[PDB]
Design a protein around this ligand. Structure first.
Ligand code: HEM
Ligand SMILES: C1C2CC3CC1CC(C2)C3
Length: 405
């Protein structure tokens, strides 16, 4: 299901990549996408999948396109178009200067000062969950840790019921990794059916939670609207539920396979922060785009107003022009260059939260369970989409080599 080539696209620029089902997923998701950076691929390609759209394949182009909101609008950031079209999240679906007042608020809710406050719970929950696992010598990391960890912290932050997780997590998943069970609009609406009542209720009787802060926030000297709050909160949910969850599994799948990487971290703890950047670079997992606001010529290619371009944040750090031996993980790189948390005016506000959550998990897991591996005959599957992930992660360990703290 390849869409006929628009008139403006030079056939020599065609490269049919399916962002939802890349070709050699079997070898890994980061690996499947890096095909785009082989020598045979032009820097800017056109794919006929998912209705036809462009893809920038290099760090340099992605950064540029990201900086350039005039040409490249966030108005319709998801592919396919019906998804980008139904997409109305704030601040994501807005460009500057409008973007800015909304950003400042979302920042109040997820920014540094909040992570600083939530630190001890993050550390408490990680230790608790790990200690609970330690004696079994086996889990489902995706389900047993990766999911609960980041999710319960967000539920805390948000002041929402843990009971709502499953229902919520299903809708978030349809957003980034469309199943086919429900379209973007249906998915979007059901999350919205959920949030509305909650918002209503926090306008009336404010709490200390993130939702309360958003619902009653100020934007452009006036009060945010209901619809506006619904829309920021909608985003906070997807980021909360869907980002850290998938990243931990990639990192953990790697650690489970690389004894010497684990050891390095065990002996030279001072390196965790660096390793965290390197892992974010290597196991980078987001890919969204932008819409052309007009006719524009970018690096010799003619882009037509209304064309969507995917600008894979995942790709920047995997690009050889940016990082020597990109597929290799080296905790001692002089320069770790990525754009895992995006680039430009839309730079991820929750970055601080995600880094704290990764750093704690590594430090904490390695402490109790320094030696683990993937279960014999478990075949690890990755999935592709706006946010890629791991399907399941069966780990096994000997209890006798663990440590209680
Ligand atoms: C591994 C973790 C994460 C990664 C890789 C990630 C990635 C990204 C990327 C690439 C963008 C920009 C997208 C664009 O330019 O269209 C972004 C935006 C955003 N992310 Fe993060 N994210 C992560 C965690 C989170 C968390 C935990 C939160 C908190 C809910 C969150 C909240 C946000 C928000 C609010 C924005 C929008 C900022 C704006 O539009 O000005 N993200 N994220
Ligand atoms: C929208 C944007 C791209 C992906 C998915 C969702 C949350 C965050 C920002 C990462």
């Amino acid at each position: 299901n390849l869409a006929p080539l628009p008139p403006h696209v030079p056939e020599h620029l065609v490269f049919d990549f399916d962002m939802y089902n890349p070709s050699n997923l079997s070898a890994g998701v980061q690996e499947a996408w890096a095909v785009l950076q082989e020598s045979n691929v032009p820097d800017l390609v056109w794919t006929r999948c998912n209705g036809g759209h462009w893809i920038a394949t290099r760090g340099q182009l992605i950064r540029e396109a990201y900086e350039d909101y005039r040409h490249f609008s966030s108005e319709c950031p998801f592919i396919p178009r019906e998804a980008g079209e139904a997409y109305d999240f704030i601040p994501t679906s807005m460009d500057p200067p409008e973007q800015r007042q909304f950003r400042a608020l979302a920042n109040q809710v997820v920014g540094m000062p909040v992570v600083d406050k939530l630190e001890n719970r993050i550390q408490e929950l990680a230790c608790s969950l790990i200690e609970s696992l330690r004696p079994q010598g086996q889990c489902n990391f995706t389900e047993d840790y990766a999911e609960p960890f980041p999710i319960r912290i967000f539920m805390l932050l948000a002041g929402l019921p843990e009971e709502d997780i499953p229902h919520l997590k299903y809708l978030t998943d349809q957003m980034t990794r469309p199943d086919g069970s429900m379209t973007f609009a249906e998915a979007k609406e059901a999350l919205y059916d959920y949030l509305i009542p909650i918002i209503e209720q926090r306008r009336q009787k404010p709490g200390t939670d993130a939702i309360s802060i958003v619902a009653n926030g100020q934007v452009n000297g006036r009060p945010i609207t209901s619809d506006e709050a619904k829309r920021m909160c909608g985003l906070l949910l997807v980021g909360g539920l869907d980002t850290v969850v998938n990243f931990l599994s990639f990192s953990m799948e790697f650690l489970a396979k690389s004894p010497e990487h684990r050891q390095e971290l065990i002996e030279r703890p001072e390196r965790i922060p660096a390793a965290c950047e390197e892992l974010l670079r290597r196991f980078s997992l987001v890919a969204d785009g932008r819409i052309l606001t007009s006719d524009y010529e970018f690096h010799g290619v003619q882009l037509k107003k209304g064309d969507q371009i995917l600008l894979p944040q995942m790709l920047s750090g995997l690009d050889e022009r940016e990082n020597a031996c990109p597929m290799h993980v080296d905790f001692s790189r002089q320069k770790v260059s990525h754009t895992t948390f995006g680039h430009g005016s839309h730079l991820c506000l929750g970055q601080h939260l995600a880094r704290r959550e990764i750093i704690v998990t590594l430090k904490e897991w390695l402490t109790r369970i320094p030696d683990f591996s993937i279960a014999p005959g478990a075949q690890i599957q990755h999935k592709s989409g706006i946010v890629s992930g791991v399907q399941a992660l069966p780990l096994v360990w000997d209890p006798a080599t663990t440590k209680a703290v």
